[model samples]
Target: RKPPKGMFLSQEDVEAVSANATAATTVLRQLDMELVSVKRQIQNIKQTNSALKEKLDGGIEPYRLPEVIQKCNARWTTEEQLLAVQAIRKYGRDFQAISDVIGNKSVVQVKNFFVNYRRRFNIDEVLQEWEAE
Candidate 1:
């Protein structure tokens, strides 16, 4: 038979309730430990931010380049070199897009050729050599 809608707790039911209360207390202790660890981590990050701010206030200034383009070393086969020259004529310094227009070589190959061209020829040298009569 079921117990009445409102009744005093039995001894067996009281024991079950005590067990659940203990389990909840254990979980709460673990949660408190995690919160302490997170707070410590936040303190460490704040210290790091303070150090960076000090450096920014008085340390060496950051360097900036005049333009995005810069010369680099690379090499290419004779045929690939010729193709790169052609692409440069068609697309200017945008060598990757030029490779797309040509539709025969990889973009990496095109990039390599541009780098090589810069190294091998003087500024406007390839243009004069190829485009001139």
Candidate 2:
């Protein structure tokens, strides 16, 4: 039969309750230790995430650039242009000789000069006279 609602527990029931209370206390302590271990793992993961994020945000190119610059600054002076024209008068279509006559000019430079400045330097008439001969 059930005990009366206002009645105290029996001695055997009291012993069971005491034993359960001690076991529950030990389980709670185990659960708290596991929570701390979980918190530590979370902290470790967050630290690794921040470190990788910093690396991703930082480098797309190298810092140390090349020291030696290439040469592309041979601007043609007025006398240099005239020397090419004089070379053209002597060498007509012989671009190698013309390049030789004008010091520091390539054969391509000489040929390019002849085409670019045919009328500008009156080399058209010079060529016509050379062809007439």
Candidate 3:
């Protein structure tokens, strides 16, 4: 049936459609209402007790991807540090030489690296020898 005017359905058609939808949705109505309320709980994430935190951790294995550097982004890394350590043992204060062997960083980075990381990497022996030299 056509609308009497601007409305798409006449009163009779509208009543039939609405009654059918109401009855049909009632079967799953509680679940449909629950789904909306549960999803809107994002901001309601109150802090949990530390006791349950570890026990409830979702550590199940996940999927994988590929193709990037093997170590920390934009920072010195273990393998790189070891390579630098080797160069230091071999070349002493030759920072450019250390940079050459590390290959991924600059001579300036090598200087800063020693300045910041000598203690972290336990390079005290080398430092003493370099200063003594």
Candidate 4:
């Protein structure tokens, strides 16, 4: 017999290579899709987290008016109103001073009520109502 014919890979080798290539391609595609989906979800979660933090920090916590102010319709009848006025009197016309004077209520709380009083009983509105009168 002449020397063996041109080099030939065994049937097993060919099949193994083909199967491995196919499996690797499938795995890579699946991984790509999974990565894309995970990235999208992460982006969405980051945005949601930012919005939630903004609402909690800037929108609600910072500017939230006291319930007492709302319930009293910004009037100075309730304990909160009395405390606010007394605080303003003792304090040097500052939020921190008001809080220091009040001792128990927070600066933000004092400011909220003070703003309510101003808006409800300001010179402009008083004059406007008097003009109506």
RMSD of each: 14.0, 23.5, 16.8, 17.9
> Comparing candidate 1 with candidate 4, which one achieves the higher TM-score?
1
User: lDDT (0-100) at residue 80 of candidate 3?
Assistant: 86
Q: Rate the local accuracy (lDDT) of all candidates.
A: 0.65, 0.76, 0.71, 0.61
Q: Candidate order by lDDT, highest to lowest? A: 2, 3, 1, 4
How many residue pairs clash per model? 0, 0, 0, 0
Tens digit of per-residue lDDT, candidate 2, span 37-90: 999999999999989999878476566655554443356689888887777666
Could you tell me every candidate's TM-score relative to the true structure? 0.34, 0.41, 0.40, 0.31
| Pairs of residues clashing in candidate 3 | none
Tell me which of candidates 2 and 3 scores higher on TM-score: 2
Candidate 4's TM-score: 0.31
Off by over 4 Å in 3: 1-73, 128-133
**What stretches of model 4 exceed 4 Å from their correct place?**
1-21, 58-133
Name model 1 segments beyond 4 Å from true: 1-21, 58-133
Q: What is the lDDT of residue 70 in candidate 3?
A: 38
Maximum-TM-score candidate? 2
lDDT of 1 by residue, 45-81 (tens): 9999999898788455466534444333244457655
Report model 1's TM-score to 2 decimal places: 0.34
